[PDB]
Chain A
Amino acid sequence: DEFEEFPAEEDAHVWEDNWDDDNVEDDFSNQLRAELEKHGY
């Protein structure tokens, strides 16, 4: 019972990727270094 009325119109990774993976940000080491030097002084 196919629905032919509606026409049926690289990154080949197997693991499930969560939305946060797409979010861009600096490395955690950089963030930790920045926070450490901010709170150090």
Chain B
Amino acid sequence: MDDKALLVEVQLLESKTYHALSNLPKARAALTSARTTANAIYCPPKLQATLD
């Protein structure tokens, strides 16, 4: 689905739960995917703040 804002939110959530599970490389990969998807849409201030 082309709703990339939801995809960014879910990728950030995946990175968060990976980091909470001590899987640092997987959390970093999920965060990088989230950033790559984020630099293709209009990120609201809340979404950009969560990304940062």
A and B in direct contact, judged by CB atoms within 8 A:
no
